[PDB]
Design a protein around this motif. Sequence first.
Motif, short mmCIF file in Angstrom:
data_model
loop_
_atom_site.label_atom_id
_atom_site.label_comp_id
_atom_site.label_asym_id
_atom_site.label_seq_id
_atom_site.Cartn_x
_atom_site.Cartn_y
_atom_site.Cartn_z
N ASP A 44 0.81 -1.20 0.00
CA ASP A 44 0.00 0.00 0.00
C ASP A 44 0.85 1.26 0.00
OD1 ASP A 44 -2.61 -0.77 -0.33
OD2 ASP A 44 -3.16 -0.55 1.77
N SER A 45 2.13 1.20 -0.36
CA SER A 45 2.98 2.37 -0.24
C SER A 45 2.70 3.47 -1.23
CB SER A 45 4.45 2.01 -0.42
OG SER A 45 4.76 1.67 -1.75
N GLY A 46 2.12 3.11 -2.37
CA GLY A 46 1.93 4.05 -3.49
C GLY A 46 3.16 4.14 -4.37
N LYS A 47 4.16 3.34 -4.09
CA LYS A 47 5.44 3.31 -4.79
C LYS A 47 5.72 1.90 -5.28
CE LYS A 47 7.13 6.81 -1.44
NZ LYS A 47 7.35 7.95 -2.36
N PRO A 48 6.59 1.75 -6.26
CA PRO A 48 6.94 0.40 -6.69
C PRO A 48 7.71 -0.31 -5.59
CG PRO A 48 7.48 1.97 -8.37
CD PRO A 48 7.18 2.78 -7.15
N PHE A 49 7.42 -1.59 -5.41
CA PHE A 49 8.14 -2.33 -4.38
C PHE A 49 9.58 -2.57 -4.78
CE2 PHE A 49 9.63 -6.35 -2.53
CZ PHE A 49 9.65 -5.97 -1.23
N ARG A 50 10.52 -2.22 -3.92
CA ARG A 50 11.94 -2.41 -4.20
C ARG A 50 12.38 -3.77 -3.68
NH1 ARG A 50 12.08 0.78 -8.18
NH2 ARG A 50 11.54 2.95 -7.69
N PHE A 51 13.10 -4.52 -4.50
CA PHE A 51 13.47 -5.88 -4.16
C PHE A 51 14.39 -5.93 -2.95
CE2 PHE A 51 15.98 -9.80 -4.83
CZ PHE A 51 14.93 -10.71 -4.81
N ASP A 52 15.14 -4.87 -2.69
CA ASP A 52 16.10 -4.82 -1.61
C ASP A 52 15.55 -4.19 -0.32
OD1 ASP A 52 16.03 -2.21 -2.47
OD2 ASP A 52 18.19 -1.96 -2.62
N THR A 53 14.21 -4.09 -0.24
CA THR A 53 13.55 -3.48 0.93
C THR A 53 13.86 -4.17 2.24
OG1 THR A 53 11.79 -2.56 -0.42
CG2 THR A 53 11.37 -2.68 1.93
N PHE A 54 14.05 -5.50 2.24
CA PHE A 54 14.17 -6.26 3.47
C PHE A 54 15.41 -7.13 3.35
CE2 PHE A 54 9.54 -6.06 2.51
CZ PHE A 54 9.16 -5.22 3.51
N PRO A 55 16.59 -6.53 3.44
CA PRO A 55 17.81 -7.26 3.12
C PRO A 55 18.00 -8.55 3.93
CG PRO A 55 18.31 -5.09 4.06
CD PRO A 55 16.83 -5.12 3.83
N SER A 56 18.22 -9.63 3.19
CA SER A 56 18.45 -10.91 3.77
C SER A 56 18.95 -11.79 2.66
CB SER A 56 17.18 -11.56 4.30
OG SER A 56 17.53 -12.87 4.73
N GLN A 57 19.96 -12.55 2.99
CA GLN A 57 20.45 -13.56 2.07
C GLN A 57 19.54 -14.77 1.97
OE1 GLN A 57 24.28 -14.87 3.43
NE2 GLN A 57 23.55 -14.98 5.56
N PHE A 58 18.48 -14.85 2.77
CA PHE A 58 17.54 -15.99 2.71
C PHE A 58 16.21 -15.64 2.05
CE2 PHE A 58 20.71 -18.23 4.76
CZ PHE A 58 21.07 -17.61 5.95
N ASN A 59 16.04 -14.41 1.63
CA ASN A 59 14.79 -14.05 0.98
C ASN A 59 14.94 -14.30 -0.51
OD1 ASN A 59 13.32 -11.20 2.79
ND2 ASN A 59 13.78 -13.26 3.51
#
Length: 191
Positions: free
Chosen positions: A110-125
């Motif tokens: 619901d941000s109104g922005k494109p979701f950024r792939f690096d939003t939740f940094p983790s080597q397991f995502n």
Amino acid sequence: DGHKVGVIYIKEGQTHETEILANTMGSPDYHRFLKGLGALTRLKGATFNTQGLDRVNDMDGQYTYCWRDRVTEIVFHVTTQMPTNLEHDPQCIMKKRHIGNDFVNIVWNDSGKPFRFDTFPSQFNYVYIVITPTPRVPFLADDEQRFVMVQVMSQPGFPEIPKIISLKALPSFVRLLALNASVFSLVWANR
């Protein structure tokens, strides 16, 4: 077979992991979506595998949502179900420990922005299943009359798994994508 899948609500304007994890509720459509995704299940004293969610002291919240079929179980790690206390845990590490260790995460954007792939940094995502509300109605077409966009975003080289989906169809559609993504993630974890 048991799977664990994150579910993360992003509020209007938010861009950064820490502020997103702090959220303790979402929109009405997001909440109706959770209720279709799984059953509300009490965590304290739980007699099933809670996939890391506290069963002793409700540290991760009193409730989560869970699904079971003839073959497998999914425990959702719903960040809005988890308590926020920014004095005790300003970085929400108690929420990050779940979603950062989940191969697959569902994102209600619901941000109104494109979701950024690096939003939740983790080597397991490995995979994000991104739900973005839209005003669009399929041109040649009540929860059957309102729609979202669903897009899968995954690491480079991850197996393929944006489509317009009604709110009525949404929880089953996303749950199937999450199950398939989880199965693939278990294999991919060996690369």
